[PDB]
Amino acid sequence: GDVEKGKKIFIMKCSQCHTVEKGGKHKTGPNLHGLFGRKTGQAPGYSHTAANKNKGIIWGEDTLMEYLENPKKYIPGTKMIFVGIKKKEERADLIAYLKKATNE
Ligand code: HEC
Numbered sequence: 001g002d003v004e005k006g007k008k009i010f011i012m013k014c015s016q017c018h019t020v021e022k023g024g025k026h027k028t029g030p031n032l033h034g035l036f037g038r039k040t041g042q043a044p045g046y047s048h049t050a051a052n053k054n055k056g057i058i059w060g061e062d063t064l065m066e067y068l069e070n071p072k073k074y075i076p077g078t079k080m081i082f083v084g085i086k087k088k089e090e091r092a093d094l095i096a097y098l099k100k101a102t103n104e
Pocket of ligand 1: 016030043078079080
């Protein structure tokens with residue numbers, strides 16, 4: 001994925017509710033630093049829904065590809081009110097940016 005394109009997707013569609021930087025603030029949604037390799041719903045200091053807490057999967061490229069295509073289908077009961085990203089290559093670019101920014 002192209003992380004420069006992914007960053008602009010993140011700004012356009014995600015930054016309204018999320019930060020990615022280490023120690024970044026929670027907003028409507030949790031700060032996302034440390035996302036990869038972590039189980040769902042464990043962002044430190046954020047009050048997740050039980051659904052987000054209980055999904056039980058580990059975030060990685062493949063699980064984020066599925067989640068971000070249709071969030072409420074993957075995690076029924078989520079309070080992330082976002083329709084999803086239809087195009088696979090856009091999701092791949094976003095997730096490549098996420099893998100870089102949430103670990104740097
Ligand atoms: C507000 C309207 C949001 C927008 C736009 C996006 N997200 Fe979000 N997200 C939001 C909330 C309120 C929550 C918590 C939901 C809950 O049920 O507790 C989330 C959660 C996530 C997560 C899960 C994190 C984890 O399990 O540790 C991820 C990975 C996530 N959101 C990603 C994400 C991306 C990449 C977005 C842009 C396309 C995006 N979200 C938009 C609220 C909102």
